[PDB]
Structures are given as C-alpha cells and as structure tokens.
C-alpha cells in the first residue's frame, strides 16, 4: 500500500493511491491498482506483468484504465472527456542506457459539455458531426485503435538532482485503419546536464520539448490530444496551459458574431526550450547543502494550430502562426524538506502575447509514504 498527497499551482490538491502484488494467487502475474485525483483529472489503472513471459530481455505488460478529464479546471475551453481503454506493450532493452517499447492500444473517448468554439467545431465537422453551436449540451463518442512506439535514452548520473548526462524520451502513436479517428502524434523530451566544475556545484541544464500531430485522409487530430505550454513544468511565469491558440466562442442561445477570449485550447504543434544555470545556494555550505538546489533559468515556448484558417477569421489573431515565441526568466528553488520534495519558482514573463495569463509565483509540494 503506497499513498501520496501533494499541492501545487498546476493541479491544486493531488491524491495518489497504489497497491502492487508481485504474485497474484500464485499465478505468477504481477497485478497493480493505481489511482490519481486532481483539480481536473481522475485516473485509475490496472497493471499486469509477468517476468516468466520475458524472452531475451523483452517483456510484456498490460494496462486497463479509466480517465475523467474536466478541461475547464485545466484552464482550457470547457469540455468533459471520460475515457477508458487497454494497452499491451513490449519492452526492448537496447543497452544499459537505451530501451524501446511498442504496443497496441484501444481507447473509448466520450466527450460532453463542449462549449462551442471554432477550432473545436472544426475538428467535429471533419468527423461528420454537426452539433448545435448555441448550446453546451452535446456528446461525441469514438472508438480508436492505436500503434504506440517509444524510445528512452537515460544516462543521467543521478535520479534526484542530476549533474551530468542526458535523458531523451521519444513517443509516437498512430490510429489503425478501422478507428473512428485518423491521426498521428509525436512527442519529444530532452534534458541535458553539463557540469563546469569538478565538484559539479555549477551545472548548465538545457531542456527541450516538442510535439506535432495531424489528421489523416481529410481528418483532423482530436482536440483532446492537443499539446499545451505554460506552467511550472513547461514555461514558468505563465499560467498553466495558457500559451497558444485562444478559443473563439459561438454565441449562446436559449432553448427556442463570434466572441474573442483568453481561454487556451492548445494546438496540434508545440515547441518549448529552456536554459538553466544551477548554482550553489548562498552561504549554506553545511550538510543541508546537498539537499538544496538553486538555479536561474530562461524559458520559452510556443503552441499553434496548423489548421487555423486565418482567411475566414481575419478579425482574429492568426493562431497558425508558429513565430509568437513567449519567453520568461526567473529563479527556482528545490528542497528535499521533511514534508517531501518542494520546488518554488519566481519568474517574469518578459515576452508575452494577447491573452496570455501570468503566474509569477508557482510551486509544487508532494509527499509519499
């Protein structure tokens, strides 16, 4: 039994609960149940593995999950996405620092409470759906099968406060013929630590994050697969997910001409980069110095909608423009305090655009037992 509670500006109060049983009723299968609850998300999975199935280091794992997503509580245009599915994954260990994975996934997405907006309705139209633009009471259910691929390079010298090496994670999925949706999606994450001194007290850190996806054969990528930027983990100094396209709402009518907004919706393309200088903490050269890390950083990122038609909506910003790079700068503090790991940051978004929401003070604190 492992439990975890946390509080942060990105996800409010976070609860986690898990149980893992290596051998379930002498079957040899390792079974695990896990749960997560956010301000905006409720997630539950059933994990299955079996080390007696592993062949030449290639392992097989199963997953059965449920997910409840409330987009309004993630600072996005309001909608609800209740989903469930399964995943079967294979793990290939290439070497001591590189692993691969490939699996098949099924997912049922049940959408509701969609607040009519242009970009959202653009995807819906491409799927043959024609729900009213004057009401939030709506529904769209789909069933998809996917092929999932992943690569992880991890050569970081230490887990908690790395000082040398890099970590790269590349993931990709595509819909299989027969699915309701028709799209692909790629994500890339990189972290690189370079120590300048022998004691590794001074370290340069470069982070990047990329995402691109689009529909296939006339379709569009569903909006619930969008990428986001802005927040404690992406571009500090900005409110969570604020970076990128903003919703253009249709007018609401009672049961019997568009509106600009500052509500983010994400996009199908995304680019984020950060440079961070890790330094010693001033005047704490005692035993507590090893558990505290101070840093100065420069963050930037952009999100855009490749299928945004600026011609039909000339009165509104061009949300297909990839060149609206947002930037911020500030200082971060990391502490392995008694109450768990803590991260505090203060950043000033010196380059922002219309609709961006600032959040200079951001912090996350967790605790697991």
């Amino acid at each position, epitope marked *: 039994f492992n439990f975890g509670i946390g509080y942060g500006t990105e996800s409010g109060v976070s609860f986690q609960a898990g149980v893992q049983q290596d051998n379930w009723l002498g079957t040899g299968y390792a079974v695990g149940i896990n749960g997560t609850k956010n301000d905006y998300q409720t997630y539950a999975e059933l994990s299955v593995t079996n080390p007696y199935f592993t062949v030449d280091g290639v392992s097989l794992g199963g997953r059965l999950f449920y997910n409840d997503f409330q*987009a309004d509580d993630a600072d996005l245009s309001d909608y609800t996405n209740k989903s469930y599915g399964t995943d079967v994954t294979l793990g290939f260990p290439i070497n001591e620092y590189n692993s691969l994975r490939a699996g098949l996934g099924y997912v049922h997405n049940s959408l509701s409470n969609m*607040q009519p907006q242009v970009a959202m309705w653009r995807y819906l139209y491409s799927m043959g759906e024609h729900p009213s633009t004057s009401d939030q009471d709506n529904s769209f259910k789909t069933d998809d099968f996917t092929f999932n691929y992943g690569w992880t390079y991890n050569k970081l010298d230490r887990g908690y406060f790395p000082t040398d090496g890099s970590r790269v994670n590349l993931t990709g999925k595509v819909t299989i013929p027969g699915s309701d949706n028709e799209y692909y999606k790629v994500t890339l994450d990189t972290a690189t630590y370079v120590p300048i001194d022998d004691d590794h007290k001074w370290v340069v850190l470069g982070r990047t994050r990329w995402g691109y996806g689009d529909g296939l054969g006339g379709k569009e990528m569903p909006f619930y697969e969008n990428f986001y930027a802005g927040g404690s983990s992406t571009v500090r100094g900005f409110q969570s997910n604020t970076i990128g396209p903003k919703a253009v709402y249709f007018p609401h009518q009672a049961s019997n001409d568009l*509106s600009k907004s500052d509500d983010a919706v994400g996009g199908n393309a995304m680019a984020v980069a950060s440079l961070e200088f890790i330094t010693p903490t001033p005047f704490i050269s005692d035993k507590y110095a090893n558990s505290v890390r101070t840093s100065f950083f420069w963050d930037m990122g952009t999100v855009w909608d490749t299928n945004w038609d600026s011609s039909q909506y000339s009165g509104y910003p061009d949300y297909s423009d990839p060149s609206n790079i947002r930037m911020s700068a500030g200082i971060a503090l990391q502490w392995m305090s008694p109450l768990g790991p803590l991260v505090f940051s203060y950043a000033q978004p010196f380059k922002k655009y219309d609709g961006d929401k600032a959040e200079q003070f951001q912090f996350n604190i967790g605790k697991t037992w």
Partner: nanobody
Amino acid sequence: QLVESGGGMVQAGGSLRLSCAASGRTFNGWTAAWFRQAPGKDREFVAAISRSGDYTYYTNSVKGRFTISRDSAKNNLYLQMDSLKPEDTAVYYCAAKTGTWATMDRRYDYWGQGTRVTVSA
C-alpha cells in the same frame, strides 16, 4: 456564501441592478455568472465574466440590454438590467466557478439563493 440582492418589481422598460457578494471572499480567482429561472422553466444562462475579467459573454436574448461587471476590488458582482421585458421575469441566481466559463448550471461550483425579478406589462 454567495448572496444576491436588488430584485423586485418593475414595469416594462425600466432598469434594475442586481448585486452578488460573498462574506470575506473575493471574485479574484473565480469565473462568475448569472442564471435565471422563469416560472415553470429550467435555469438558463444569462451572462458571465471571465476569471481575467477582460471578456464578457451573454445569452442572445439579453445581449445589448444587460451588462455584467465587477468592481475594482472584486468584492461585488453586478448585473445591470436595462430595457426590461416581461419575459425577463424570473428568479436570478449568482454562480461562481474556479475554471473557465460555461453555460450549464451543473458546471458551476457555488450558488446564491436567488432574488426574484418581476417585470409587468
């Protein structure tokens, strides 16, 4: 808790100003909205103001006649009701939300008790 005030009875054409406040609370980090329930009917969206406060959204029937706003300190939420019609007769409810705005009542987290507005021919 949310408390509405400013209702009553007015002849068609008149004006009203509804007010909503919460003791010791502010609307700083909240999306706020007004709903109304005409007799025999369901709660329907009237107007809303974004968390940022820079954007306002109205139902078509009241667009151009009603105005939702907040005071500088964000202690009070207002609905200016001009050019009243008989169909505007309803119990008006104040609502608040932590996330982005919506038009469905069940998407809002906190509600007032309602204040009655009657417009006579």
